[PDB]
Amino acid sequence: SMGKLSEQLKHCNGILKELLSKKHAAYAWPFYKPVDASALGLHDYHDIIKHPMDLSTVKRKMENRDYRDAQEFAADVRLMFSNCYKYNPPDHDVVAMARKLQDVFEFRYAKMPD
């Protein structure tokens, strides 16, 4: 393999599986598919959020070898969360859910050895 990079991408793949898993579903589910701005009525979503991201897209990119390394994977997970914080008011339910999921992500990702 390309060894350590490859190892760390496998580690990321496990983090992604965890984020998608039933144990986190109570707060992760808004992040399972792209934001459907039409259905939600967010007429300006794509005007404010230039680079949408969600866990299904992270999964697709992982599987398609589009990430060089764990840092690029993490950047997309963080982009997903940051888009949520960017678009929404701080008191919104989805922002709270994003934080709750982010603190799982950040703890798991931080445990990856350098």
Ligand X SMILES: COc1cc(OC)c2c(=O)[nH]c(-c3cc(C)c(OCCO)c(C)c3)nc2c1
Residues forming the site for ligand X (CB under 6 A):
30-31, 35, 40-42, 84, 87-88, 92, 94
Please, which residue, 56 or 71, has the CB nearer to ligand X?
56
Tell the smallest beta-carbon distance from residue 109 to ligand X (Å): 19
Report DSSP state, residue 32: S
Helix (H) or strand (E) holding 95: helix 93-110
| Conformation bin of residue 113: beta by default, left when phi > 0, alpha when psi is -120 to 50 | beta
Q: How far is it, in rounded angstroms, from Cα 91 to Cα 89?
A: 6
Nearest residue to the partner ligand X, using Cβ? 30
CB of 12 or CB of 53, closer to ligand X: 53
Q: How far is the CB of 33 from ligand X (least distance, A)?
A: 8
Least distance CB 47 / ligand X (angstroms): 14
Strands of 3-88 (E only): list them.
Answer: none
Residue 3 CB neighbour total at 10 angstroms: 7
Give whichever of 9 and 55 is closer to ligand X, judged by the CB atom. 55
